[PDB]
Amino acid sequence: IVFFDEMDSIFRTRGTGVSSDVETTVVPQLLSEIDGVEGLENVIVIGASNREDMIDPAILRPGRLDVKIKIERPDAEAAQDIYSKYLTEFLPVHADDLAEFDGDRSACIKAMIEKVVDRMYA
């Protein structure tokens, strides 16, 4: 696996960039290494980007970057899971906060997560 972190500005959007012109030589090399005359067998190229439009189109076409995975901003249902990923039942929990749950830490944490989500998405 070859991971190109920050692929959004990776080597250019070809034919763009006033300050730098390294694109015309760096982009074709990568375009020829992947899906060239001789092709790789078991190599996976993974890129992460914040600006999809800023990546050159010739590399985004199928055969070079096949599977396009989009991550969206979480909704309430995803926010509940994300909060559960951090508010584990191992944190020091206040006794007065467990008073209304009779010591049931998991249920208390679930209710706190629900209240937090409701407040944040009100």
Partner: peptide, 17 residues
């Protein structure tokens, strides 16, 4: 306001043994 790329010019060097 522009960027440049360098091409080197090698200098002669010779040593014995």
């Amino acid at each position: 306001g522009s960027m440049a790329q360098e091409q080197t010019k090698r200098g002669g060097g010779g040593g014995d043994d």
